[PDB]
Copies of this chain bind each other. A is one copy, B any other.
Amino acid sequence: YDIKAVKFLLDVLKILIIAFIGIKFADFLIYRFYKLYSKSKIQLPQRKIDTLTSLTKNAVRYIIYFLAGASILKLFNIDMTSLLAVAGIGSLAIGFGAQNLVKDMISGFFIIFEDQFSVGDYVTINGISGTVEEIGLRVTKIRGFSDGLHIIPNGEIKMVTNLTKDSMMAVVNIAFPIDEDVDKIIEGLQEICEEVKKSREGPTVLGITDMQDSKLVIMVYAKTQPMQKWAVERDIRYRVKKMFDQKNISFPYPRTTVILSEKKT
């Protein structure tokens, strides 16, 4: 009948009493981390935080059941490495699945901690531009106009270009025919920058920026206060159109030279 059979009992006992203490203690701490976020009603409708509370309860129960079971099993001569080879299917699947969640959060943490963009400026993130409306630490929300509300997981942000930082820059690339008088148009554009400066950096006439088949491209650019940009550009375009009509300068219509051939069928 041996002498250990009592010690053994002390062992399965130790596991049971520790697991019990554990459950009750967890239920306590959870009911407290509950008490707080619940009684103040700072954020989060109840319907959700209840689902989240039972989420945590369930998680901790399953963990405790698993540890106590595994331990008792050890007590009956079951090999824990083999058990590891089973349980680790889930260590691996959950661990690697959750990695992305951790990524999003670290990402968000920096976005915020480094004030990459404040809860209101107009940015472009991953070829998607819009005005930032919300900045959680798992997701940034950005609504472009005409485009919808984009919800973007912070981890996916590979680069965030901010459009409205230390100001903004407006550009217009005007196109003329090379079959055209350069100095007259550069003069006209000069006069347009002149006039625009008069209604509240630039705007200036940078040289002929590109030379093409039948066209010739001169850009005007101006440094503008945050957001006044696309507006400035539209002002400038209207100005260029009217200037084209008054100075009677011919338009950049593509043109062909054609050679005729004497044949039939």
A residues within 8 Å of B by Cβ? 11-12, 14-15, 17-18, 22, 48, 51-52, 63, 66-68, 70-103, 105-106, 110, 113-114, 116, 123-124, 126, 128, 138-139, 143, 145-153, 156, 158-166, 168-172, 174-175, 177-179, 182, 206-216, 221, 230-231, 234-235, 237-238, 240-242, 244-245, 250-265
Contacts and interface: CB of A to CB of B under 8 A. Distances in A.
Contacts of A98: 89-90, 92-93, 102, 106
Contacts of A254: 213-214, 254, 256-257
A243 B22 CA distance: 77
A94 B102 CA distance: 6
B89 A208 contact: no
A165 to B, nearest CB: 4
Contacts of A79: 67, 70-71, 74, 80, 83
Given A67-B83, A128-B159, A258-B259, 20 more contacts: A14-B77, A15-B77, A18-B73, A18-B77, A22-B73, A81-B81, A82-B83, A85-B88, A90-B95, A92-B92, A93-B95, A96-B99, A101-B106, A150-B159, A150-B160, A179-B265, A208-B234, A208-B241, A209-B234, A257-B259
A93 B102 contact: yes
Nearest to A80: B81
Contacts of A87: 82, 85
B148 A159 contact: no
A17 B76 contact: yes
**Copies of this chain in its oligomeric complex:** 7
Most chain-B Cβ atoms within 10 A of its Cβ — which of A17, A72, A76?
A76
Contacts of A209: 230, 234, 237
A66 to B, nearest CB: 7
14 contacts: A80-B81, A84-B84, A85-B91, A92-B98, A128-B161, A148-B168, A175-B212, A182-B238, A209-B234, A213-B252, A253-B256, A253-B257, A255-B256, A255-B257
Given A93-B99, A151-B161, A169-B147, A113 B51 contact: yes
A264 B262 contact: yes
B106 A86 contact: no
Nearest to A48: B113
A87 B87 CA distance: 12
> Shortest 10 CB-CB distances between A and B: which pairs?
A97-B102, A92-B95, A207-B234, A70-B82, A18-B76, A93-B98, A148-B163, A85-B87, A259-B261, A257-B259
Contacts of A17: 76
